[PDB]
Structure 1
Amino acid sequence: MATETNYPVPYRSKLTEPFEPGQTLIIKGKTAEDSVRFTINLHNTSADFSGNDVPLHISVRFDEGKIVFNTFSKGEWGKEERKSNPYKKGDDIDIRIRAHDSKFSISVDQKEVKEYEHRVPLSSVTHFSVDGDILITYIHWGGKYYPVPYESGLAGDGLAPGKSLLIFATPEKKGKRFHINLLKKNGDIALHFNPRFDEKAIVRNSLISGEWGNEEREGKNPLEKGIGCDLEFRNEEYAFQIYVDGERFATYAHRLDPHDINGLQIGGDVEVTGIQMV
């Protein structure tokens, strides 16, 4: 009888619109030493049909040590496709499903481990459910195919104090570095976040009147080439709180007045899959 606070299993959710290419479904949670398996299903039937048509069925098994993928259509399960389960009976799981026009790309712990070709229409995916021996801690879907270099304004309030900008990205396998700029109307950059793999460091700096300031670097640099990451920039009272994959990576004293930060740029050797302002 886990706390209904988190996502109670069985967890049944309905998408706003059908799952589109470029969108990602993220499922995070915890398992116990007694968990045998849990499932993730991309369902159909807006009329709520528990087990009607299932474009993609994911079964991670600690008893079999494998992750199973299959499709249910025309009232029948099809042929299974298997992959090794980086298992870990007990401890956190991070599974992400990204839709593309010819298949689903599934990543475990932000590492691409499976390409599942569509067998039935992706557009039939109108729901998703999670069940089994798992304690769901986080679920989220969205994103799109973001072109990089990327550049856009931020809604209206922009990244104002008390708000946080979440960016899901994947540094390129053969990339050297990439950057993210949080700018102001005149072109000044309140925050330049520049992961440089060749320097094994993440450079943070500000561009004021065309002149770069003092470089703040050195730190864990928890990023890895080819491995997806969750970047979060929380604009607080005295400084930006920079989170990387759940943990605070650094703090950056405001050098420019917060407020009016409504410019965003992303460049370098990186793939961007999600951007949300909370």
Structure 2
Amino acid sequence: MATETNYPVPYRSKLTEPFEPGQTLIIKGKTAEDSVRFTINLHNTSADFSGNDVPLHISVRFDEGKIVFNTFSKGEWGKEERKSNPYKKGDDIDIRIRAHDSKFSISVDQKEVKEYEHRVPLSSVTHFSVDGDILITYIHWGGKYYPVPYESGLAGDGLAPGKSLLIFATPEKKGKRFHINLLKKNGDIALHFNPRFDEKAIVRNSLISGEWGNEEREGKNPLEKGIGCDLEFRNEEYAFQIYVDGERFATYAHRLDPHDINGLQIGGDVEVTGIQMV
């Protein structure tokens, strides 16, 4: 045991509403040199009956060196399904579970590793728990099926200074490029974020009164076809701080007065699984 703060195990959370197709559950944490295993469960129960059905049990085992999936229903477990555990005792873990109408899609380190077909109703999932040799650093459930091209207004204050736009996406395995535009009311694009795999660069520019600006590239593309990524756009005093998978990828000096950035567009060869203003 080391440090508590938030998300101490055993962690138990009652969902506000049913886990529905299109939603994702993200669990990040750290393990220790002596961690043996930890579990993640999507379980039934109305309030806290404890002992009901378990519509997806995930066991990450360091001893066995495998990630094991199973279901518990009507008082009994089914046959386990296994995949290799890419993690060594220690080092951080990143597990993501996305619900679909016929299965759960599980990713480890943002890489799809398992398609678990529903064995019992997904609607039975009313709670999720995490326990074992793990220190939880981040837990989030939400998202939906975002259609792309995508377009929407941003809150009432939009991407204002001191705030950040968080986007969870996966560039398509056979995609060439995709883009994310942060714009103003008149249609000017404050920031154009455009990953181009066929050019091995991410282009950043601004569209002002119908004309494209300079264009800032270079900085080694941190994205990869078919792998999930967490993109963060932090609106700061002098520039947008662009983070990719937790690391600052670049800075982009404001060319348009910040403030009043309440427009978002996403297009190209990409799948979007979550968008949030933090």
Per the shorter chain, which TM-score range? over 0.9
Please report how far the alpha carbon of residue 50 of structure 1 lies from its aligned counterpart in structure 2 after TM superposition.
Answer: 2.7
The 1-side partners of 2:218 and 2:176 are apart by: 17
The 2-side partners of 1:172 and 1:258 are apart by: 31
Please report how far the alpha carbon of residue 78 of structure 1 lies from its aligned counterpart in structure 2 after TM superposition.
Answer: 1.1
Cα RMSD between the aligned structures? 0.8
**Where does 1:33-48 land on structure 2 (aligned, <5 Å)?**
33-48=33-48
Is the CA contact 1:61–1:87 (under 8 Å) kept in the aligned structure 2? no
Is the CA contact 1:69–1:80 (under 8 Å) kept in the aligned structure 2? yes
The 1-side partners of 2:275 and 2:243 are apart by: 14
Q: Which moved more, 1:42-51 or 1:200-209?
A: 42-51
Question: Cα deviations across residues 176-223 of structure 1 (Å, max 9, x unaligned)?
Answer: 110000010100000000011111111100000000001111003110
Question: Cα deviations across residues 117-170 of structure 1 (Å, max 9, x unaligned)?
Answer: 111110111110000111111100100000000011112101111111000000
Please report how far the alpha carbon of residue 265 of structure 1 lies from its aligned counterpart in structure 2 after TM superposition.
Answer: 0.4
The 1-side partners of 2:172 and 2:178 are apart by: 9
The 1-side partners of 2:77 and 2:270 are apart by: 38
Please report how far the alpha carbon of residue 33 of structure 1 lies from its aligned counterpart in structure 2 after TM superposition.
Answer: 1.3
**Where does 1:14-163 land on structure 2 (aligned, <5 Å)?**
14-163=14-163
SS at match of 1:250: strand
| Counterpart in the other structure of 2:222 | 222
SS at match of 2:123: helix
Is the CA contact 2:14–2:47 (under 8 Å) kept in the aligned structure 1? no
The 1-side partners of 2:251 and 2:14 are apart by: 37
The 1-side partners of 2:235 and 2:108 are apart by: 30
Is the CA contact 1:2–1:8 (under 8 Å) kept in the aligned structure 2? no
Q: Which moved more, 1:150-159 or 1:226-235?
A: 150-159
The 1-side partners of 2:65 and 2:190 are apart by: 47
Relative distance call for 1:3 and 1:50 in structure 2 (3 A) is farther
SS at match of 1:199: coil
Question: Cα deviations across residues 5-59 of structure 1 (Å, max 9, x unaligned)?
Answer: 1310101111110100000000001111111110000011122133321000000
SS at match of 2:33: coil
State the TM-score, normalizing by the size of structure 2: 0.98
The 1-side partners of 2:84 and 2:239 are apart by: 43
Please report how far the alpha carbon of residue 87 of structure 1 lies from its aligned counterpart in structure 2 after TM superposition.
Answer: 2.3
The 2-side partners of 1:186 and 1:46 are apart by: 49
SS at match of 1:198: coil
SS at match of 1:123: helix
Structure 2 spans left out of the alignment, 5+ residues? none
Is the CA contact 1:39–1:59 (under 8 Å) kept in the aligned structure 2? yes
SS at match of 2:198: helix
Over 2 Å off, 4+ runs:
1-4
The 2-side partners of 1:206 and 1:64 are apart by: 51
Please report how far the alpha carbon of residue 236 of structure 1 lies from its aligned counterpart in structure 2 after TM superposition.
Answer: 1.0
SS at match of 1:161: coil
**Where does 1:156-235 land on structure 2 (aligned, <5 Å)?**
156-235=156-235
The 1-side partners of 2:200 and 2:67 are apart by: 34
Please report how far the alpha carbon of residue 86 of structure 1 lies from its aligned counterpart in structure 2 after TM superposition.
Answer: 0.9
The 1-side partners of 2:116 and 2:234 are apart by: 35
Is the CA contact 2:18–2:125 (under 8 Å) kept in the aligned structure 1? yes
Q: Which moved more, 1:82-91 or 1:13-22?
A: 82-91
Is the CA contact 1:40–1:57 (under 8 Å) kept in the aligned structure 2? yes
The 2-side partners of 1:62 and 1:261 are apart by: 46
Aligned-residue sequence identity (percent) comes to 100
